[model samples]
Target: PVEFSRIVRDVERLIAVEKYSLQGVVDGDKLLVVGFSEGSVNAYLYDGGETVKLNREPINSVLDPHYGVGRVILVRDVSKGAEQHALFKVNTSRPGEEQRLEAVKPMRILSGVDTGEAVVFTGATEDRVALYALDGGLRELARLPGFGFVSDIRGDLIAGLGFFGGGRVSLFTSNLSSGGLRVFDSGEGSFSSASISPGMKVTAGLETAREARLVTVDPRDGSVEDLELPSKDFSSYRPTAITWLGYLPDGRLAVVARREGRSAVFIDGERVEAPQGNHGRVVLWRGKLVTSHTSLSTPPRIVSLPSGEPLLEGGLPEDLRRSIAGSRLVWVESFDGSRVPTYVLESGRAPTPGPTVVLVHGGPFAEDSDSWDTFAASLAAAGFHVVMPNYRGSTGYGEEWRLKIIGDPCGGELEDVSAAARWARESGLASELYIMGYSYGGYMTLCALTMKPGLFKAGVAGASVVDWEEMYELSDAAFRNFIEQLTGGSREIMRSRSPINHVDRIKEPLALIHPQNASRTPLKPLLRLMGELLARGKTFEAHIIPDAGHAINTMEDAVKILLPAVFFLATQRERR
Candidate 1:
């Protein structure tokens, strides 16, 4: 142990200089920081020794050393052109001895404790993990199906978030690599996020149905206990989302939650007085809270949690750093007379209604709110009214409202978007009407230009989906599964939901932006729509991002996409 301390002390500062940011504080002084300054994930172990570097291909995610060290530095590493994202077991015990972090392929020995133990994990052709384990990755180590597998681990247990319908999801847990397993199952409701606390109940958060529930489970006994989180305004959307989940050393639960666009931390179901901003990931270490904070007006900050104190705030680009706009919540009545929630972002330069661009959020299931969005801000910077709507299918709204679009798909939702445009114009909020979106929003944009003609004078669609029918039938099983879940499982249901099916009806000028590698919307369908539009001599254009997939993942990618789209939208309004 003395030799280990001496080695760590020697390398501590050396590696800290190499990797500046710590991803997790865990429970002790031994912190894991990643320094990827144009490098592979160079994980620095600063256990007061000289920081040691463990290099590997880009990492999917890193687990905490909090629960127990070298129990396994669980990893899912990407293989440069490898068929599937493979699983890896990084040994942490030899922190002082082995700085390069090799020994993943042949299996790593955790000191003398757990010998020759494999990670009990697997992979597919592309894009899957136990964390992405829709069908139960490591929990059962089953070849699972699903996107965004969210999970956490403990000494001898593995717990993860699972799929269920309604205000709940399945909580699957097992002792030491899916050997002894039990699933906390239900269909009454689903969870937004979950937490696994050692020596305490495994907690899952629910804010949708009738009340906010932090469902907890006893690790030893399968007994369940429900957290008495207060009920929120029934009319409001899913206001309660667990941003942070963990416990204090004394076995008390502590969590950070976002309710109705505002975030705060709760200790033992009692509100811990904190600052008001949108909090993302959080850690309640020992007695202090460590997390990041952001908002529509503010960039992210590594903040002191529970108390809401600032530790160090991150910076945005100079252009984005400069204030452009701050939005206010407004309700726009949809065509069905149902209230549609939205964000009316002003340039903060005063309310002189100018060219309006309705910025639709993707996901049909995802919603936009107090959280900051660079694309929306970029539009606002170009002197356009940014109307970010939490349309019908968006979450946070009552579960019934979310289900409103399910099998119904585009019919009612399209009307809601059209409703946003109408309200913006009728209420004098927009001087000239325009609309844009990405991903499904891109899909919705095409629907607006075609299904509801004359709604948007000109617009841009980034990483847009054209035909749900095509997306469902084609694409990989992974994507097909996603489309099914999103559009309500029946493959034939969305056959008529695509705007591409009737692109001939689109008369307004439009520009589409998509990444070449995007599998969700893919390049083929988008290219097909371009060809069809060209055949008709319709007013449309496109920018295909090379080697990029899905929505803009980096700030650099955002500038490339947003600059052109914003300029084009402005030019169209200028022509008018």
Candidate 2:
């Protein structure tokens, strides 16, 4: 077991006692944190010194409460088909009251008009946006006419806002009363996020084209003006997140944008480079551009740029800093000769290359790059060299590469795993390899063990899809359509490539960990199907974690399941 520090001990105890999710947001001197699960929401206020439980089940999104004036509106589920979702209006000042604010039914709220603050959240069922009223009244905004999906919305309460969808962005006055949507600008690329300044200057990031451009739009009439950027070298970078730093004192617009590998700050279309080794979220703080930088090599630093130059720097606590520094960062090459980025952490000293755990990330389309992942690092500290490969189907690479693994789901992707193992063995990174994956990765692990049995000593598949044929049958209509599109619209291909069909080929010890309430593939059917396969002399362990869905949401659940998994793999005999 890993030794618990005072902060970790305090945080863990507090979370357990309060039943909090432990996910928090740090703001100024106060940390406003909220945790919600099942049907309850818990709010907490943490000052620099101590934390205070503000309220439990504070407010309902549907009921417009008037405890205080100008209450911040919070909508839980405002997507099209999720009309039954509860909406809450929280009076941040007031603490502890009847959480039932109100319940807004599906038919009551309009389909397309519901838009949320911060970001445009696309609901699963209907193509609708969640709208927030300044007085805590939640409603659905107008829906897009032609486009099936709305990509993003930019701008805030004061200045005019822009909404982009179907490869076009439209400008609209923030006033929901009389201001109607008007077509602002059209582009070939779909907009993901936008940054707007006080002067209505906008910089938008394109997802399809992987480009960011500074554009000026007329607040009254939808007209576009393009500004020249200082660097054209960033053509290869695809924008992930973009934020406006507001207007600088020099009247220049400051923008902070992040791509695949690096994050940069731009002032009046000119790129501002920070000192080497600094990476973070760039934002405007106290009239200066500030960024919170942290990496495997350096501690978390809150750096400020007063005159567009490094002004002040504050280091994180020694305990946290030391943990951050000890992390091992690497970019493993895939079988296709592409770099798959990963980070690992081991306590005290690096392990002597024993019992390595190969962690496969979810979202067959998602790539876990420099972003912080607690679970992977925790496993590393437990004496496992946690290997995360951005496989063939992962994003961050262009559309072509991402779409390449669509039809051949478990085939080409497994090649990436094989390459990762060879690379680790060649570099003396891992002595014994074990495979662990969640969701699609879980499915991939099962396939890896069956196809390349010699690669891993043991395997753990969490919330995995063993029988793709059964999964597609039980999957929702939308998911079935998605599968058809992904796997070349052929049932024969899915059946042939399914790991369940080749269970007899798996020689290594395997653990099939599944969620109890898996919507896509119900546990009863999955367990029954696996039992039949096991009866045929398949060597595997089966477990069903109660109250877990497709993803391991809770940290406790992850630790409980993953600890034993790594331990089991460690004790397994290596197949030389």
C-alpha root-mean-square deviation, each candidate:
9.6, 7.0
Runs in model 2 with CA error above 4 Å? 1-132, 135-177, 183-187, 219-221, 229-252, 267-283, 290-331, 342-349, 550-556, 559-561, 573-576
lDDT of 2 by residue, 62-129 (tens): 22111112233344443543444544444445544324335344322221212233222222225444
TM-score of each: 0.73, 0.72
Best lDDT among the predictions, by candidate number: 1
Candidate 2, residue 491: how far the Cα is off, in Å: 3.5
- Native-to-model Cα distance after best TM-score fit, residue 6 in candidate 2, in Å: 15
Error of 2 at 413 (Å): 1.5
lDDT of 1 by residue, 528-573 (tens): 8888898988987778877654444344554457656866776686
Worst 10 residues of 1 by lDDT: 106-115
Q: Please tell me which predicted candidate would have the highest TM-score against the true structure.
A: 1
Q: lDDT scores for all predictions?
A: 0.60, 0.53
